[PDB]
Amino acid sequence: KGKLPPVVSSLIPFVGSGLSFAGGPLQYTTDAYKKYGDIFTMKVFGQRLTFLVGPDAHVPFFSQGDAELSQDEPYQFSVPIFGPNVVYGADLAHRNQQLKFIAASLSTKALQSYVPLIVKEAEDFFAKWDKSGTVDIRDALAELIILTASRCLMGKEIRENLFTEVAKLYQTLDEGLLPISVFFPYLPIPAHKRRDEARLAMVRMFKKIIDERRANPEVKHNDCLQVFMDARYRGEEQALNDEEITGLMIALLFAGQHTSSVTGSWTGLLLFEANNKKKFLPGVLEEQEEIRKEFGDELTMEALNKMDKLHRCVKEALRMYPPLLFVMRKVIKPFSYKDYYVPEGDTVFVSPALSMRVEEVFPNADQYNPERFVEEDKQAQKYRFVGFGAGRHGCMGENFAYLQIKTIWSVLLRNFDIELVGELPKPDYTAMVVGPAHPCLLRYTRKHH
Ligand X SMILES: Clc1ccccc1C(c1ccccc1)(c1ccccc1)n1ccnc1
| Residue 327 touches ligand HEM, criterion: CB under 6 A | yes
Residue 254 touches which member of ligand HEM, ligand X, none, C-beta under 5-8 Å by kind? ligand X
393 annotated as a binding-site residue: yes
Phi first, then psi: give them for residue 52, nearest 5 degrees: -135, 120
- Of 318 and 408, CB closest to ligand HEM: 318
- Of 324 and 441, CB closest to ligand X: 324
| Residue 395 touches ligand HEM, criterion: CB under 6 A | yes
Interaction pattern, residues 96-115, with ligand HEM; x per rule: CB under 6 A: ---x--x---x---------
329 annotated as a binding-site residue: yes
- Of 395 and 421, CB closest to ligand HEM: 395
Size of the site for ligand X (CB under 6 A): 13
| The dihedral sign for the CA sequence 142, 23, 398, 226 | negative
- The only residue of 54, 74, 247, 387 in contact with ligand HEM, by rule CB under 6 A: 387
Residue 388 touches which member of ligand X, ligand HEM, none, C-beta under 5-8 Å by kind? ligand HEM
Report 313-352 residues binding ligand X (CB under 6 A): 324, 327
| Residue 396 touches ligand HEM, criterion: CB under 6 A | yes
| Residue 255 touches ligand HEM, criterion: CB under 6 A | yes
**Contacting residues for 206 by C-beta, under 8 A, at least 6 apart:** 154, 225, 242, 245, 246, 249
**Contacting residues for 281 by C-beta, under 8 A, at least 6 apart:** 271, 272
- The only residue of 41, 98, 259, 407 in contact with ligand X, by rule CB under 6 A: 259
Nearest distance from C-beta of residue 428 to ligand HEM, angstroms: 16
Question: Radius of gyration of the chain from Cα atoms?
Answer: 22
Of the candidates 293, 296, 278, 309, the residue with the CA atom closest to the CA atom of residue 406: 309
| Residue 5 touches ligand HEM, criterion: CB under 6 A | no
Q: How far apart are CA 413 and CA 322, in angstroms?
A: 23
Burial of 252 from C-beta contacts in 10 A (0-12 / 13-18 / 19+): buried
28 annotated as a binding-site residue: no
Q: How far apart are CA 93 and CA 388, in angstroms?
A: 24
194 annotated as a binding-site residue: no
Cβ–Cβ < 8 Å for 207, 242? yes
- The only residue of 87, 318, 356, 420 in contact with ligand X, by rule CB under 6 A: 87
For the chain, the distance separating the N- and C-terminal CA atoms, rounded to the nearest angstrom, is 67
Nearest distance from C-beta of residue 328 to ligand X, angstroms: 7
| Residue 384 touches ligand HEM, criterion: CB under 6 A | no
Of 11-19, 131-139, 178-186, 252-260: span binding ligand X (CB under 6 A): 252-260
Of 9-17, 251-259, 293-301, 348-356: span binding ligand X (CB under 6 A): 251-259
Q: How far apart are CA 232 and CA 23, in angstroms?
A: 44
Residue 258 touches which member of ligand HEM, ligand X, none, C-beta under 5-8 Å by kind? ligand X
Q: How far apart are CA 196 and CA 80, in angstroms?
A: 7
Of 6-14, 280-288, 317-325, 417-425: span binding ligand HEM (CB under 6 A): 317-325
| Residue 210 touches ligand HEM, criterion: CB under 6 A | no
- The only residue of 17, 20, 41, 78 in contact with ligand X, by rule CB under 6 A: 78
| Residue 395 touches ligand X, criterion: CB under 6 A | yes
Q: Give contact residues for ligand X (rule: CB under 6 A).
A: 75, 78, 87, 251-252, 254-255, 258-259, 324, 327, 395, 397
Known binding-site positions: 71, 75, 88, 329, 393, 395
Q: Give contact residues for ligand HEM (rule: CB under 6 A).
A: 71, 99, 102, 106, 252, 255-256, 259-260, 263, 318, 322-324, 327, 387-389, 393, 395-397, 400-401
